[PDB]
Amino acid sequence: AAVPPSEAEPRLQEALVVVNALLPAPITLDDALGSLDDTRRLVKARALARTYHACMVNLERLARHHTIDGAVAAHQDKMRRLADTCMATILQMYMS
Amino acid sequence: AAVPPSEAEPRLQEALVVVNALLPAPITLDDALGSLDDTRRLVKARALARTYHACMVNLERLARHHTIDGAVAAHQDKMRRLADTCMATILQMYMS
Amino acid sequence: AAVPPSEAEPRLQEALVVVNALLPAPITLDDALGSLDDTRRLVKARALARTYHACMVNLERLARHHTIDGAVAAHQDKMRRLADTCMATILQMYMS
Amino acid sequence: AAVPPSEAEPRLQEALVVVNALLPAPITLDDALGSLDDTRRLVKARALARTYHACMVNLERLARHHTIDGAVAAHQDKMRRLADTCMATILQMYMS
Amino acid sequence: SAATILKQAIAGDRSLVEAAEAISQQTLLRLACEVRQVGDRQPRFTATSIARVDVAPGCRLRFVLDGSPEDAYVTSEDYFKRCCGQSSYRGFAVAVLTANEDHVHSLAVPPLVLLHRFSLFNPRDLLDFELACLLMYLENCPRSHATPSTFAKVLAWLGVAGRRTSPFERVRCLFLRSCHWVLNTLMFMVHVKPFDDEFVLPHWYMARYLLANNPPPVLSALFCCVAYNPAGIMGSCWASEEVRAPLVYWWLSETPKRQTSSLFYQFCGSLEVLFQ
Amino acid sequence: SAATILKQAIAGDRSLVEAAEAISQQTLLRLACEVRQVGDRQPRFTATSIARVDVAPGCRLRFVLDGSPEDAYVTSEDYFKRCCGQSSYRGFAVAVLTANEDHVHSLAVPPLVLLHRFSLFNPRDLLDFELACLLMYLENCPRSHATPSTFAKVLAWLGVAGRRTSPFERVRCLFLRSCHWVLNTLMFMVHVKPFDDEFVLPHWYMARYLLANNPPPVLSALFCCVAYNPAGIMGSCWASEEVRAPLVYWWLSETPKRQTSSLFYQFCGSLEVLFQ
Amino acid sequence: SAATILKQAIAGDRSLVEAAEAISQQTLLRLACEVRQVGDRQPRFTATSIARVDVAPGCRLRFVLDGSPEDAYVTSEDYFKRCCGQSSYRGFAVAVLTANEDHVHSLAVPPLVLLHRFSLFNPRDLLDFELACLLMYLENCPRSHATPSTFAKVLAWLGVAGRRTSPFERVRCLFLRSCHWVLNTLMFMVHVKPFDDEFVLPHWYMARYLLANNPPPVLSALFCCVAYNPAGIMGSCWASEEVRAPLVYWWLSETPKRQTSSLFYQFCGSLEVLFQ
Amino acid sequence: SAATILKQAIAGDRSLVEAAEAISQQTLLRLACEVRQVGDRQPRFTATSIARVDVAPGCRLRFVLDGSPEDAYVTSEDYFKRCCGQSSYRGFAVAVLTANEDHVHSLAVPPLVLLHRFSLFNPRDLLDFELACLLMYLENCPRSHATPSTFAKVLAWLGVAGRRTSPFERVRCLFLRSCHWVLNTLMFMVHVKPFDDEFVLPHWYMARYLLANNPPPVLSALFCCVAYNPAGIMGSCWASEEVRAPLVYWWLSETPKRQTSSLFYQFCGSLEVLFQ
Ligand SMILES: [Cl-]
Ligand SMILES: [Cl-]
Ligand SMILES: [Cl-]
Ligand SMILES: [Cl-]
């Protein structure tokens, strides 16, 4: 079955090769791609952490600056609900 | 003997490479191909194991439902011979 | 300096690869090529070992089958000299 | 998604491969290229070491062959300053 | 062997990816057990830890541990934290095999060869831990829990785990298909139609028929500190001293233990080629 | 996974070099500490050795060592020689991570997995030593030294070190980006605009907002012989027993240690291909 | 060296497969022996266990063991099971050589180099066990059993074993050609025409003629717990202390042993190449 | 780094083979010594064993051993046999360096890095043994034997050894060029014109001029169980405790030793590529 060189002359190709790992061992490509994906999701989630923080600053401002007058309590309820919404969305992303 | 770059300019080719083993170590390609071949032979052999089982059920039915009348003994002999034939073929495949 | 994909679209090539060492570790290609060369020289040297053996058999025949008659001694001298020449050539090949 | 062989026939390419490291472990390509660069800079720096040596021989000749006559002292000052300049340039290359 | 893959791909009209998948699908992990060792004292290999498995509303695994009351479940997360917090806990020991090597009451792997099939698994996250727990549970599952309800819950969970996993997650895929082999063989052994009869271990398919009742010795001959369930339908390989002595000897003699998470060699990097 | 890189390169219009750099930039070294051991006695892990860092006129690093007077600086060269001359000195221990694994008060790496992330670094020259020294300093830097002046000096030095480094010097690059991650996160944690907000560790960005004042347990739950600075802003991972016990256990193990200078596989040599 | 293969293939008009086979055919295994060690006591290396070999009607190997009656055969399967069941049994020790290194009464391999040529073989199946058993038998075979009848039976069995073996089964091929080298050299040494004179070990071809009767010292100089047959025609390398001391020292060393089944590096997997 | 090779090849008009050879020529072996150890007792590192070297009529090396009469030569073959026959003899220890690291009275390699540069050489044949013996002799050669006659004999022998050696015999080539570096530097240090001034170690070329007579401290600062010749012109690196303590510590370590004959990775085998 073998084809002799006289019928199919062999070819010899030579090169200098340089190989370098992209990542430090034992980090895998899946690990680094998963980290890049998590980081991109967490960079987007900065908006939620910032919004939660704004709610908490507003709650501090309401408590520091101040019954049958329910105005302050109505403002506190609005800030508490928005912070809860932010918190719920962040928790869903973390605890998938 | 050396050909200088001025006569045969060197070429540099660059790529990102990703290499992944197909099989878990220390399993070899020969091991997994041999297993795929054994499994395919054993999947075909299911017909023999099923036929042997039918002979054994028929033998149980003959013994449970029941001399100069040799009818039952003639049926038992037929089932015993077919089960023996199945057994012989299975043993030949296993003990090659 | 970087060329974006929009100017030079990347290509992805995929293959299944199978790699098998030719020789058992720790044997190197140089070791096996050196052995093939030594074996080819030693196969040619069989002529010398056979000729030396012929001289030694002739010496035994001369000693077993048998003064002012120097005939036997002249034959023994010829066989001893040819065996010495074979021995010298074999030693030169071994002790290079 | 899979393209069957009947639509895109697979190809099998085979070769004998020989791979040999250029450098002895654990020496890296960066190490050997850094050494080649240092050696080339040090080969150029031989001119500075030779010039420093000539200054020092001239200083020995001035001290061995020999006040209101400042001639010898003027020559010694010139040789001392040139040797100091050579030394400063060598130190800058070593202590970058 | 590459010419064999090429011939198989063409003959079956299967893509090279499909042909390679059929080959890799012959591999599985068996003999899953938790390893515990206090310093340099006698080690303990336990495959009985999970008595019952259940799937939570949000498709998360929950377990009834061995010795705990019948309906006292722990979440897989709480059991993962408990194990990670135990200084004696060393991870899971597993043996890698091909499907043709599992001969029901024995393994067609000599004891000194089996020594080189074990690896130590240190779950990287919850999903990894759940997969090892599920494999071990399925191998040690008795008749009482091998029910249609359990089979449906296990398959549904494996379906959700499978959709979360890509084929390049080689180790997760290995644990997933090991669960499919053990699950489908278990269903077959209890005379229940398997979800996929291609995942019934081939010697087990033969043994259920050939060893059904008072088998002749000639048929029986084809098949022949370690806690395993003696009533475990899929755990009969554990009874063999040619299986247990190599596990213990591997734990005490193999100096640099192979990590299950490293079973599949990987390289990712730059390749530069210079030539004239 | 190569199809993922291709998709990312095209989608972002980033060259393959840029796409690969974005992936490798997710890796960093953490838990930098000096290892000292007298024979086979109890080892010491010290991350507190450098109390202060300053840059010399010729952009060389100088340090105030722990226990030394406030303004008693030693050159990085003199500290390198002192360490090389100490028989007990074994180099630096470092743990390799991806950015998504650092969860501020914990690492999302199980203790038995973390065991396999440590490597021993033996600085090959002064620049290597300075990089390990700087990483360790930044991780343990208290509020008092986390100032705009310190930030400016550190960035300027990293800029000079960066210009001296090529991307093929993989280990130096790894230490350099680790310094950028720790530096930018430190600036963010002291409410100072980071030089590069892409180098603020992603969970730390979330934690500064979510754990600001009296956080609810549900938010705190997302984040949870070893000398470290307890007042070190970036060193809060050191408090965890799930971080310190693996470091000690890794050191004491008789299995040979991975050298940090060998983290990136390299091959350089001839390739000959023969075919008909 | 690839340019040498190319030159040889062209000069002899041999395909690259044939040229590579001529190179690999220079390698063989020698010094085959069974290793037994009870705990950490003194090891025992036995090359005399098989006194006689015979071929069954279905071309299966049968053995007369050492000390058993002249015609009391055991099947190769029963001897394989007995060895696998012995707790002291460790497998077979073998040394890898090139044909030019076997100098009849010595090996042209320094003792400290020979230390690195030994490997431990744990037969994976019956055929593997039979091959190791046959190699050891042939090396220790005395004049009384080196007969035309034995030669015919051994060749016929090797022919059947050869047809069952693929050139990609590197280890089986290595044991098979080692049997051909030892068999053909044995026939030559008893003045019987070998089946293949290309398989007579090259220094043995020279030694039979040069050392025939009262050789001069100058010719003799070219050639010079371990149980071996002193009357074994092909086992004269065993007499050398420069052969036996390295075997024992290799065994007693704490460095993990090379597995014979792993002598030939293999990789099978996916290759993805990304470039612009 | 491949782009650097390409740029260098084009800029100097050197073929890729010539460009690669210039890079590999920067590597050499130093600190050649014989290792002797009786069991687990205190080891001995001897670099003084050969007092004199001479070339026989048939261009074979002969030596006068340390302690032997001035004109009492032993053939290199007899010394090779004597060493192979000594149970305490372990081979030669050597350290691999780049030419820029040899700083005359010190090595620019930190002691913990130097630990990883040592390898153990077990000569495979006489030529290997002669090369290690010659390197060790040249490094320890005093002024009395550093003569034109010795230089001529050494070069002539190296020329004959070089013609017998192909560039694919990587280890022999490494020992050969190490002899050329040490020989040409030795000639330079005794104010004799070197055969090849490109083989004078670059820091030694500088040191001969800069440290000639009463050097200022600032110039001396650039350069700074073990038996070595204190009068050995090329052996001044041996004086450093930062050289000798790593050698002993490297030896005493229980971690397996790198073999000098394995410094250059090699693969030879079949490559099969399957694609659609
Ligand atoms: Cl995975
Ligand atoms: Cl680097
Ligand atoms: Cl094989
Ligand atoms: Cl070599």
Author numbering:
A (entry chain B), B (entry chain D), C (entry chain C), D (entry chain A): 24 to 89, 96 to 125
E (entry chain H), F (entry chain F), G (entry chain G), H (entry chain E): 11 to 234, 253 to 304
Task: Give the exact sentences the study uses for this entry.
HSV-1 tegument proteins pUL7 and pUL51 promote virus assembly by stimulating the cytoplasmic wrapping of nascent virions. pUL7 and pUL51 form a complex that co-localizes with Golgi markers both during infection and when co-transfected into cells, palmitoylation of residue Cys9 being required for pUL51 membrane association. We characterized the pUL7:pUL51 complex by solution scattering and solved the atomic-resolution structure of the proteolysis-resistant core of this complex using X-ray crystallography. pUL7 comprises a single globular domain that binds one molecule of pUL51 via a hydrophobic surface, a second molecule of pUL51 being recruited to the solution complex via the N-terminal region of pUL51. While the fold of pUL7 is not similar to any known structure, the α-helical pUL51 protein shares unanticipated structural similarity to components of the ESCRT-III membrane-remodeling machinery. Given the conservation of the pUL7:pUL51 interaction, the conserved localization of this complex to trans-Golgi membranes, and the established evidence supporting roles for pUL7 or pUL51 homologues in virus assembly, we propose that pUL7 and pUL51 form a complex that is conserved across herpesviruses and functions to promote virus assembly by stimulating cytoplasmic envelopment of nascent virions.
